[PDB]
Amino acid sequence: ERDCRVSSFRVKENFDKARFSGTWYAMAKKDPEGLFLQDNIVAEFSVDETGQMSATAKGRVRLLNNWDVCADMVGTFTDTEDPAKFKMKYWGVASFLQKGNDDHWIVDTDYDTYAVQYSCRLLNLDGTCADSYSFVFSRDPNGLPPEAQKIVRQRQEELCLARQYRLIVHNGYC
Ligand SMILES: CC1=C(/C=C/C(C)=C/C=C/C(C)=C/CO)C(C)(C)CCC1
């Protein structure tokens, strides 16, 4: 039935920055092509007097050939007409770690438990994503409540990504 075309994906209606600030732990990930954050991912969202959201993240990264850094990144969110959609310019603090611009959308969150993020880097000629990533976020490093987990799993499904994720560890690494 449902359509996996990016423009169809629903986002978090009336998204609120402030409400969203804080720490978030990465419980599950859907990796994109190439280089990406491995595990122990923690993000920390913030917004300023100007209403511009931002954030720092950190997690193990397995640089080429087993060389495990503990990356520390910085993203800065440029708004869009859609409040749940932003353009995220990121970069690391060291200059060799990866820099980029990524669409960052908030598929759904409840500010206090979970958040589901999605990002489509490259679209297919059919409107579906050719290269995406998704992050399931939890306010508790221990995981989400069965009630929360249930909706999340529903979202993973509407993103045509269910069954593509992978649990993320937080073993102390960073
Ligand atoms: C900015 C940032 C994000 C993206 C971080 C990325 C995409 C890190 C990639 C690191 C690379 C792979 C380092 C290896 O050199 C996430 C979405 C978690 C949320 C907001 C903070």
Q: Is the CB of 53 under 6 A from ligand 1?
A: no
Q: What sign for the dihedral angle of Cα 53, 86, 21, 62?
A: negative
* Segments forming the whole domain that contains residue 39: 1-174
Distance CA 76, CA 45 (A): 10
- 70-77-38 Cα angle (round to 5): 25
Q: Can you give the resolution of this entry in Å?
A: 2.5
Question: How many other CB atoms sit within 10 Å of the CB of residue 157?
Answer: 12
CA of 14 to the centre of ligand 1 (A): 25
Distance CA 141, CA 174 (A): 14
Token pair belonging to 126: 């059919």
Amino acid occupying residue 78: T
In contact, 54 and 48? CB cutoff 8 Å:
yes
Q: Is the CB of 91 under 6 A from ligand 1?
A: no
Burial class (CB in 10 A: 0-12, 13-18, 19+), 103: middle
- Selection from 103, 100, 99 nearest residue 80 by Cα: 103
**Tally of structural domains, the chain:** 1
In contact, 55 and 45? CB cutoff 8 Å:
yes
- Domain CATH code at residue 20: 2.40.128.20
Annotate 17-59 with three-state secondary structure.
HHHHCEEEEEEEEECCCCCCECCCCEEEEEECCCCCEEEEEEE
Residue-by-residue DSSP string for the chain: ----BGGG----TT--HHHH-EEEEEEEEE--SS--B-S--EEEEEE-TTS-EEEEEEEEEE-TTS-EEEEEEEEEEE--SSTTEEEEEEEESSSSS--EEEEEEEEEE-SSSEEEEEEEEEE-TTSBEEEEEEEEEESSTT---HHHHHHHHHHHHHTT-TT--EE---SS--
CA of 72 to the centre of ligand 1 (A): 8
Which residues participate in the annotated binding site for substrate?
A: 98
Q: Is the CB of 61 under 6 A from ligand 1?
A: yes
**CB within 8 Å of 120: residues ≥ 6 apart:** 6, 103, 129, 131, 132
